[PDB]
């Protein structure tokens, strides 16, 4: 019946920086026993697609492997896991995790974002393949690639008319190399409108461009 | 130390469906088990718990009575038998070793976890993707769109998996259809495109589907 409450939900700090993720319990998890009194609570990393991983367990012990950098503190009800200096392979949610009462409960988990050198985004543009106009239907996909930070604007235009409401985005995670973003876009339209119109255009805007990239094409040529 | 959980997929409400897993590189026989699982988008919630002998089981409020948690120590194999199956079941499942020493009750340290298996419940048909081109026109970007697939996911290589660098598998995005969408996108230099072909090997298992989509380029 003890709830766990992470804070931040994300943070972004820079290479080599220190990232501080807070965890408090609802009750205390501090247990007293014949021998020294211990703190009943872990700490785990997760990293998108892979297996969890044990940090620190005792509130403040390592794990065999776990490097130093990682601490963890605290002690009752409020604790604290210290990134001493981040690296890009540190990137990923991690959770608190008391075992003092019976269900054991984890924490919400807070995002560990690398902040890295701004970069601007590669756009590319895709028309609806062949395949897929016979098919019926027509989706056209704009791609945003290799950017930092993650946030961009993309904005369709058809015939030089605005779009809204009929596209969809989806971002990847931040790279486990150069901890950069990529961003899919995609129009989707109907076969038929699609043949009425002739030029599709995506216009970008991040903090990395100077002024808005566009991509564009025209459908019958 | 290994775990590997297998099994696991799309279920109707109400029906039933059995999660196994696989573990080696610890004296299995002697260790506490537990299932923790993972809705999407929330935190970590542990399911079961169960002892060396199975004697001694445990569960989560949540499940008891439906979930029933089962070891084989002769193939190192660790079960959880899920019935009576809900929307709100759906979530990866992880296989964890508890950090207790043989023969002493459990931890609840979850010293090593497996990769986790998804388990879908939905009364929505299944139904696989279609796979088209994302055609290319001193680095050029490939791709190939998987439009219309339920229930999640559909895992993406290029060239059989010979090809890695540059990939990038966006996460699905759900349409209005209530079906799903995806598209996955690799970048390469510009003057291979003539000479070297891309192919994208989609694969859904739920439907059943595997598909290997060669990308043309567009010359003019």
């Known amino acids: 019946d003890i709830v766990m409450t992470q804070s931040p939900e994300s943070l972004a700090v820079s290479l080599g920086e220190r990232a501080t993720i807070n965890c408090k319990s609802s009750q205390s998890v501090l247990y007293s026993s014949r021998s020294d009194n211990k703190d009943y609570l872990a700490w785990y990393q997760q990293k998108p697609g892979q297996s969890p991983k044990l940090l620190i367990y005792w509130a403040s012990t390592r794990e065999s492997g776990v490097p130093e950098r990682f601490t963890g503190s605290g002690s009752g009800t409020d604790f604290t896991l210290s990134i001493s200096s981040l690296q890009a392979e540190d990137v990923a949610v991690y959770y608190c995790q008391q075992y003092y009462s019976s269900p054991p409960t984890f924490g919400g988990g807070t995002k560990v974002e690398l902040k890295r050198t701004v970069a601007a985004p590669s756009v590319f543009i895709f028309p609806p393949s062949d395949e897929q106009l016979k098919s019926g239907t027509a989706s056209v996909v704009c791609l945003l690639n290799n950017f930092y930070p993650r946030e961009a604007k993309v904005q369709w235009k058809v015939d030089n008319a605005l779009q809204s409401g009929n596209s969809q985005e989806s971002v990847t995670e931040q790279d486990s190399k150069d901890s950069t973003y990529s961003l899919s876009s995609t129009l989707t339209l109907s076969k038929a409108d699609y043949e009425k119109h002739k030029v599709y255009a995506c216009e970008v805007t991040h903090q990395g461009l100077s002024s808005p990239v566009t991509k564009s094409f025209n459908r019958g040529e | 130390v290994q775990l590997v959980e297998s099994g696991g997929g799309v279920v109707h409400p109400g029906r039933s469906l059995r999660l196994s897993c696989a573990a080696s590189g610890f004296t299995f026989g002697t260790s506490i088990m537990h299932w923790v699982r993972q809705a999407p988008g929330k935190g970590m919630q542990w399911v079961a718990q169960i002892s060396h002998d199975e004697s001694r089981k445990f569960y989560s409020d949540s499940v008891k009575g439906r979930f029933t948690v089962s070891r084989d120590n002769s193939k190192n194999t660790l079960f959880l038998e899920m019935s009576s199956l809900r929307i709100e079941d759906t979530a990866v499942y992880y296989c964890?070793?508890?950090?207790?020493?043989?023969?002493?009750?459990?931890?609840?340290?979850?010293?090593?976890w497996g990769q986790g298996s998804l388990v879908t419940v939905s009364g929505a048909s299944t139904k696989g993707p279609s796979v088209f081109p994302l055609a290319p026109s001193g680095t050029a970007a490939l791709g190939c769109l998987v439009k219309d697939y339920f229930p999640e996911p559909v895992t993406v290589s290029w060239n059989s998996g010979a090809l890695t660098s540059g990939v990038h598998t966006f996460p699905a995005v759900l349409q209005s259809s209530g079906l799903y969408s995806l598209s996955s996108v690799v970048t390469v230099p510009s003057s291979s495109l003539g000479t070297q072909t891309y192919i994208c090997n989609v694969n859904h298992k739920p439907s059943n589907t595997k598909v290997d989509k060669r990308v043309e380029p567009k010359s003019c």
């Open positions: 964890a070793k508890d950090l207790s020493p043989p023969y002493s009750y459990a931890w609840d340290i979850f010293q090593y």
